[PDB]
A = this chain, B = another copy of it.
Amino acid sequence: EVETFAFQAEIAQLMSLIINTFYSNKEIFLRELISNSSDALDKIRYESLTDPSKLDSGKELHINLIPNKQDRTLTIVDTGIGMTKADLINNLGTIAKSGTKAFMEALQAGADISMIGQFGVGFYSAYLVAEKVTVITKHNDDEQYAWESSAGGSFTVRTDTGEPMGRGTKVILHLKEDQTEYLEERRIKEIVKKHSQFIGYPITLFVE
């Protein structure tokens, strides 16, 4: 049912750098994950331009933000192109090995962690606030998978038989104990307004 994989050495090193570096401006994770959602949404939209049946799995192109104080999770859902099993395994559709190398040569040259997205590995900023991350995804050319990691050098992939989602990607952030401010409506609103004001898809902040 569940396969376990090792992160390539460079990705594991990126993940330790994000987890262990003292760095206070953690809120940029939300921008990186929304921006990722926007890229996936752009992709399904571009595909629908020549093949409208690509949208048979859902015409709505949007991003939802769902906080849950009881489970201590912030979930980001989008109706973008989604990922195949192979995409999930190859670093969630990123060029993360070379992107990590570039990012680290910048960090030497003075840059800081807020610029991680410029190197294509913005996802991993999720580990600034999350102790575990679960990625649930559905691409038109494959079944629904769940990817999951709590860092420490490994991730899992399983075929997800739970809630079918049609098409897209759901990112569930199991928040660190001292990071529950990102479940507060006021705070999420503030971050979205600050860093994500010109995203070309509706972003709905669910309430509790």
Binding site for B on A (CB under 8 A): 42, 45-46, 49-50, 86, 90, 93-95, 98-99, 101-102, 106, 111, 115, 118-120, 198, 200
Copies of this subunit: 2
A200: chain B residues at CB < 8 Å are 98-99, 101-102, 119-120
Among residues of B, the one whose C-beta sits closest to the C-beta of A200 is B102
Which residues of chain B are near A102, meaning CB under 8 Å? 198, 200
Shortest Cβ distance from A142 into chain B, in angstroms?
14
Q: By CB atoms of chain B within 10 A, which of A115, A118, A119, A200 has the most? A: A200
Residues on B with beta carbons closer than 8 Å to the beta carbon of A115: 198
- Besides A98-B200, A99-B200, 4 new A-B residue pairs in contact (Cβ under 8 A), listed by A number: A102-B198, A102-B200, A106-B198, A115-B198
Candidates B46, B50, B95; contact of A42 at CB < 8 Å:
B95
Say how far A148's CB is from chain B's closest CB, in angstroms.
22
Contacts of A93 in B (CB 8 A): 46
Among B86, B94, B119, which residue has its beta carbon within 8 angstroms of that of A50?
A: B86
Give the complex CA separation of A86 and B46 in angstroms.
12
- Known contacts: A50-B86, A50-B90, A86-B50. The answer to whether A119 contacts B45 by CB under 8 A is no
A-B contact pairs, 24 of them (CB 8 A): A42-B95, A42-B120, A45-B95, A45-B98, A46-B90, A46-B93, A46-B94, A46-B95, A49-B90, A49-B95, A50-B86, A50-B90, A98-B200, A99-B200, A101-B200, A102-B198, A102-B200, A106-B198, A111-B198, A115-B198, A118-B198, A119-B198, A119-B200, A120-B200
- Distance in Å from the Cβ of A60 to the closest Cβ of chain B? 14
The 9 closest A-B CB pairs, nearest first, are A102-B200, A45-B95, A106-B198, A118-B198, A46-B95, A42-B95, A49-B90, A42-B120, A98-B200
> How many angstroms from the CA of A115 to the CA of B119 in the assembled complex?
19
With a cutoff of 8 Å between Cβ atoms, the chain B residues found around residue A118 in the complex are 198
Please measure, in the bound complex, the distance between the C-alpha atom of A50 and the C-alpha atom of B89, giving whole angstroms.
11
